[PDB]
Amino acid sequence: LLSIFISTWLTAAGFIHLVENSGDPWENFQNNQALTYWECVYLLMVTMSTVGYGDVYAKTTLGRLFMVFFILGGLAMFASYVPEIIELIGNRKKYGGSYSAVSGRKHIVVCGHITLESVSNFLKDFLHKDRDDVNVEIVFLHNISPNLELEALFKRHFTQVEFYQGSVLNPHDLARVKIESADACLILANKYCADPDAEDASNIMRVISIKNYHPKIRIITQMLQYHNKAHLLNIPS
Amino acid sequence: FALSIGALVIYFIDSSNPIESCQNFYKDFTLQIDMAFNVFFLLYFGLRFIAANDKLWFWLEVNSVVDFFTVPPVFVSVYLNRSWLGLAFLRALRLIQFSEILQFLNILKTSNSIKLVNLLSIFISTWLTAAGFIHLVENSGDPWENFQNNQALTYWECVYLLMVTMSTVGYGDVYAKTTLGRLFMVFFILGGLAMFASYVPEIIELIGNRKKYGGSYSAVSGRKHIVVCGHITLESVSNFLKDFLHKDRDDVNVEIVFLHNISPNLELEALFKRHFTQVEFYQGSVLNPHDLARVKIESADACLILANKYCADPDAEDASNIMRVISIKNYHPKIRIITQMLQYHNKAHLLNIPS
Amino acid sequence: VSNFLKDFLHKDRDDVNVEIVFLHNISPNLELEALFKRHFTQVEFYQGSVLNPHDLARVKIESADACLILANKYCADPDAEDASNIMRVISIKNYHPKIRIITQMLQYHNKAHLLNIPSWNWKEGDDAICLAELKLGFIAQSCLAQGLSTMLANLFSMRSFIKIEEDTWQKYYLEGVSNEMYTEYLSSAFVGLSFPTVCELCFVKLKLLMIAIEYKSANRESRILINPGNHLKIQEGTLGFFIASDAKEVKRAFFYCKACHDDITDPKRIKKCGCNVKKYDSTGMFHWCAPKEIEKVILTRSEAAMTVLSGHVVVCIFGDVSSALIGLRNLVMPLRASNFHYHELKHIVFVGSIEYLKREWETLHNFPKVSILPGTPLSRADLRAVNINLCDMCVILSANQNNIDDTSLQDKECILASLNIKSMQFDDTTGVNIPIITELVNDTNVQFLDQDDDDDPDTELYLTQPFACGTAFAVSVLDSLMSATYFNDNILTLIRTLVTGGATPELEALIAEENALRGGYSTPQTLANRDRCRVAQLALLDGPFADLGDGGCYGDLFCKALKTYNMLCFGIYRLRDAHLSTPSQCTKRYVITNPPYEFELVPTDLIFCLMQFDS
Numbered sequence A: 001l002l003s004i005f006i007s008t009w010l011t012a013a014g015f016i017h018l019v020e021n022s023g024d025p026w027e028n029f030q031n032n033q034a035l036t037y038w039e040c041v042y043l044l045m046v047t048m049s050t051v052g053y054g055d056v057y058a059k060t061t062l063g064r065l066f067m068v069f070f071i072l073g074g075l076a077m078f079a080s081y082v083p084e085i086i087e088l089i090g091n092r093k094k095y096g097g098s099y100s101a102v103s104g105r106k107h108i109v110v111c112g113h114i115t116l117e118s119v120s121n122f123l124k125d126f127l128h129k130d131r132d133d134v135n136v137e138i139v140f141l142h143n144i145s146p147n148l149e150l151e152a153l154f155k156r157h158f159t160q161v162e163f164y165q166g167s168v169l170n171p172h173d174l175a176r177v178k179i180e181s182a183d184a185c186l187i188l189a190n191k192y193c194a195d196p197d198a199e200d201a202s203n204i205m206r207v208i209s210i211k212n213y214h215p216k217i218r219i220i221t222q223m224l225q226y227h228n229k230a231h232l233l234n235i236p237s
Numbered sequence B: 001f002a003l004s005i006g007a008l009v010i011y012f013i014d015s016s017n018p019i020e021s022c023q024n025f026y027k028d029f030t031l032q033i034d035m036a037f038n039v040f041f042l043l044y045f046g047l048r049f050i051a052a053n054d055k056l057w058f059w060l061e062v063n064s065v066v067d068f069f070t071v072p073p074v075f076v077s078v079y080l081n082r083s084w085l086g087l088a089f090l091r092a093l094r095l096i097q098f099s100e101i102l103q104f105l106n107i108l109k110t111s112n113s114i115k116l117v118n119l120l121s122i123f124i125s126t127w128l129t130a131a132g133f134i135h136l137v138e139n140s141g142d143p144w145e146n147f148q149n150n151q152a153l154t155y156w157e158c159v160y161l162l163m164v165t166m167s168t169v170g171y172g173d174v175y176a177k178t179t180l181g182r183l184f185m186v187f188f189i190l191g192g193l194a195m196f197a198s199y200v201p202e203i204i205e206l207i208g209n210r211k212k213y214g215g216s217y218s219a220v221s222g223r224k225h226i227v228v229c230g231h232i233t234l235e236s237v238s239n240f241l242k243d244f245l246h247k248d249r250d251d252v253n254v255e256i257v258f259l260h261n262i263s264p265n266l267e268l269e270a271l272f273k274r275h276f277t278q279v280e281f282y283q284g285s286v287l288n289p290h291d292l293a294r295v296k297i298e299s300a301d302a303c304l305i306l307a308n309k310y311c312a313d314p315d316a317e318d319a320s321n322i323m324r325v326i327s328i329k330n331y332h333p334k335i336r337i338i339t340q341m342l343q344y345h346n347k348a349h350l351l352n353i354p355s
Numbered sequence C: 001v002s003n004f005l006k007d008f009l010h011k012d013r014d015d016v017n018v019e020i021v022f023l024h025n026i027s028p029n030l031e032l033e034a035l036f037k038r039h040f041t042q043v044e045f046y047q048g049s050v051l052n053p054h055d056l057a058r059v060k061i062e063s064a065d066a067c068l069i070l071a072n073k074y075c076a077d078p079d080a081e082d083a084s085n086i087m088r089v090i091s092i093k094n095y096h097p098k099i100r101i102i103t104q105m106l107q108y109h110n111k112a113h114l115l116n117i118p119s120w121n122w123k124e125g126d127d128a129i130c131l132a133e134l135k136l137g138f139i140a141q142s143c144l145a146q147g148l149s150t151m152l153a154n155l156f157s158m159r160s161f162i163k164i165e166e167d168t169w170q171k172y173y174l175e176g177v178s179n180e181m182y183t184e185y186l187s188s189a190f191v192g193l194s195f196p197t198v199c200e201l202c203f204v205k206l207k208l209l210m211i212a213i214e215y216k217s218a219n220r221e222s223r224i225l226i227n228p229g230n231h232l233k234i235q236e237g238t239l240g241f242f243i244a245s246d247a248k249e250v251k252r253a254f255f256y257c258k259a260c261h262d263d264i265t266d267p268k269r270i271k272k273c274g275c276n277v278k279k280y281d282s283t284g285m286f287h288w289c290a291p292k293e294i295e296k297v298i299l300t301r302s303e304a305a306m307t308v309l310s311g312h313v314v315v316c317i318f319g320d321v322s323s324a325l326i327g328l329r330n331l332v333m334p335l336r337a338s339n340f341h342y343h344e345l346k347h348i349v350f351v352g353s354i355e356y357l358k359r360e361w362e363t364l365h366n367f368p369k370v371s372i373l374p375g376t377p378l379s380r381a382d383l384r385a386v387n388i389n390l391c392d393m394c395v396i397l398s399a400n401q402n403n404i405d406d407t408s409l410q411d412k413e414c415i416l417a418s419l420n421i422k423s424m425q426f427d428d429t430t431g432v433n434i435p436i437i438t439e440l441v442n443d444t445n446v447q448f449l450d451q452d453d454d455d456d457p458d459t460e461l462y463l464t465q466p467f468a469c470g471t472a473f474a475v476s477v478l479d480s481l482m483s484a485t486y487f488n489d490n491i492l493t494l495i496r497t498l499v500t501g502g503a504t505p506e507l508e509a510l511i512a513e514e515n516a517l518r519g520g521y522s523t524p525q526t527l528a529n530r531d532r533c534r535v536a537q538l539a540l541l542d543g544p545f546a547d548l549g550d551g552g553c554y555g556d557l558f559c560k561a562l563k564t565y566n567m568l569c570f571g572i573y574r575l576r577d578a579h580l581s582t583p584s585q586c587t588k589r590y591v592i593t594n595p596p597y598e599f600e601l602v603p604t605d606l607i608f609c610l611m612q613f614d615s
């Protein structure tokens, strides 16, 4: 794209330079304008950005005709190439990247069923005004992008709460949120599910993944059914 | 329409003359030709008028009003033996019907091309008539100042001025100096911006939605290709490409062409872009022989059919894969096929195909 | 829409100045938009509902020539779709009672509701095309004589003629596809003459094949008579149905006069210058038996193996306990017509899920010889237990008319079933010679049923070997019938009276009243009503026409059959590899509709004919 833009710019400038310096053929070449090539490059750039200073312009009839056609063609080509410009701009990631480990600042990784109500209750109790000053940050990890209410809640606590899109079962995402240096991992559960046993198995598998990545981390999990917690004794870590 | 074009050319020639001058009708035959054109237009107007269901709505038709401002000036000119430039540029509006003429001549058939020709014709006609208005006003001068504000602008310089203005460039080398000229330029800027804003949706529609995975595979000489179809998702394609395109694998000049009627998502698009030098994708169905011809299945080395391992009914998936095999062998019976089968009892159906 | 526009806006169709306006409250997708843009000079679309009178006023329904209502063939509940279409008919007739309406009906029992609308005038052109009834009647008549469905479909569909110079079968076949069906008023010179005499005169002199007439009486309404015997005489102003290549030549039947046209033999020179036990049902037109429970017809595999079935019909069904009903009665009613003797009736064996068949047995338990083999059509054991190698016809039907992610995949079952039967081996030798009819949702799949073919993939439906041989039935041809119904309303009536087996409106009313077939004691009136004509095929190997079939002309056979046995021959079912000098083992045959007088015969030919009933 850059090469085609530069090439058409340079060739249009050269053509305008030739036409302007040559003069009108039917008037015995008495309409010549002493324009250098680079002044014509400057003229083309000023025209195609729709600025139009008017300090330099084409005076010959052929020069003006070709400037009109160049304006038409340039607008048409830009309109045609807009979709490629949008594609190259693309869709910027919003919740990518990795957590930055601030020295002297512990962080807690929160995962599981992350929605408005559970996060709101946990943040309401955790970040209390009467709570003693604790230098602990909270990092949420979840592979469903937050909605408007969750985004507003995160923006309200933007100085202490970060969010990232990823899966706990993926070790790359675990490395992204610096789980190897987290003080603790807190796993929330979906209290409103068709099958509590499936949710319990999913949470136990998340515990297995986290303890596989780093066996020394502290984990606090939510369990729905009582008989499912015995599975946690089957994990050696 | 041809006579309208001729009258427009007559106006173009006449614009290079003083805007009001005495002349003899019998001395120059160009004025006679214009008179014949105008009386033909009057006859056509009368023919339309005598066969009009509604008088008022026909009276407000753009053809009627453009004929109203053309032939009475030429009548007064031939009666007074003196010609004034007038509003002849309005004849350019007769170019709007140009697309319809082409249709009668059966030159245009598709609807999109007809709409494009209509849009180009309306743009050109309004450009030319606005330039004509500006030229007339600028050369005439202000009426209340005894026409002492005349600016010697040719018609084509006014066309250039309109083009430079409407692209929002504005060199300032040529501009309107009279009061009426500046007023008309302000109104023209307002109207042009409004019309462009109104016509943006049609511009987007004519640009349309460009196909992303259409077209046909190009057969590179000396380069075999393998056609892969079936259940194409991230995991199956990732595993197959991981084993097939191994770094330690011996150098093989084989390309891979995927054919699938569901467009890929972001992960598949990224995976295809990573292997863009050896992997191509196309949108289509194996059961459609046109899509089979698109991917050049008649010259493929082999066809590989992947199965959806994760389905409610394995027998339905097996039947679908067997039917895909039937379609491929119907198109080209000599191609080699490697398929994935879910259930063991379903593969006996493959013995029912003689190919 | 694609099928309807393909048949309606045919290039070979005569110039008609008719525009088409679609009204639908779902916006079209990209493919429909492209199709509309392709026909933008003749097709318009509007968003609205038929049930809204404002939308009806928008499309100028008060000045429309006709309203055509298409049905969703692929729905969970056919009865809901039928009720919706009937309500649309009610709305349209409420807005304008004088408009002509042609509607599509899914189930047969739902069309009686159309008689409850006072504005519904059947005599003025209002018609309902029942998809299930017509399709299963076509299949049943093809069971009686294979290839009849192809002949009928080519007889009312516009087909472009292609000239073939090489000696192939497509040449002989493409000759007949040109034929069409017309209706004309017989000339006053034909009054007082028997039907065979007029038919022979039309065939020899005017080169027209007259199939049926419309007989009027004071006691009853007008009734279509298919090839009546010599006892009947032509009355005044009787409509006749002709099969002809050109529409202009049909007028010769109306302008014929013996004074100045009998001397001339050339049809081109003809001008307009005149000069104790219940065995049948209440109406006596169908075989009837006392109702029996489903337990008395279910056969186990061993029990079906013990009995020997030969010359029977095997209906393989891909049913389900939740799938939509297909109305199997419309398949069994034509096969149980009263014009067949009891010993000529073909045993019917249904192979499929018993859960589906229990829902259909309520309308099938009054017919004499019907058996059930619970199982699946895809098992070779069940097909061997039912003697599939000795059946007269195998009919593969798919009840699972539910929508699938891919439209073509809807035919995944039946095709495999066909490919199973063609691959079986038998010993006293292969399944390729077993006659099979398969319904097909997609036309593009028709070439999947045959492998011994050289058809290129862009071959049209009517030129493929499975279609030309009658071994495949495509439902899309019914979508053409509606268009053929618009230009002529008698075509549908003739097709119904030729295909369904003779369902009189009195029987329609009785079935509407009771939703069942009622038996009745035999009376001379019913026994007289029994005498009709039936579709049959004849071989020239050892019949009375054996000598004439060895190189003779078709016209001599036609004249001799019509003069002697009152038999109406209207087509040749000809072995595909008959024009080749080298011998072949292929038993496939194709359809030649209405061959000319000078057409040559070969001993390996079958003749379509209309048999009279005799006792």
Ligand SMILES: CC(C)CCC[C@@H](C)[C@H]1CC[C@H]2[C@@H]3CC=C4C[C@@H](O)CC[C@]4(C)[C@H]3CC[C@]12C
Pocket: A018, A019, A022, A023, A024, A025
């Ligand atoms: C695709 C491209 C290359 C084709 C376009 C033709 C171009 C290159 C031609 C056509 C007419 C030509 C002009 C005609 C007359 C003259 C006068 C003389 O002093 C030479 C240069 C000049 C000013 C020419 C420059 C080049 C030119 C504009």
Ligand SMILES: CC(C)CCC[C@@H](C)[C@H]1CC[C@H]2[C@@H]3CC=C4C[C@@H](O)CC[C@]4(C)[C@H]3CC[C@]12C
Pocket: B069, B087, B136, B137, B140, B141, B142, B143
């Ligand atoms: C729909 C359109 C046609 C109607 C608009 C009216 C236009 C055509 C009228 C209204 C005012 C008029 C102007 C009024 C005064 C003069 C001064 C004199 O030298 C004649 C031309 C000129 C400059 C006129 C040109 C035509 C004009 C602009």
Ligand SMILES: [K+]
Pocket: A049, A050, A051, B167, B168, B169
């Ligand atoms: K600008």
Ligand SMILES: [K+]
Pocket: A051, A052, A053, B169, B170, B171
């Ligand atoms: K400017």
Ligand SMILES: [K+]
Pocket: A050, A051, A052, B168, B169, B170
């Ligand atoms: K500017």
Ligand SMILES: [K+]
Pocket: A052, A053, A054, B170, B171, B172
């Ligand atoms: K400026």
Ligand SMILES: [K+]
Pocket: C154, C155, C156, C157, C158, C159, C177, C178, C179, C180
């Ligand atoms: K036909």
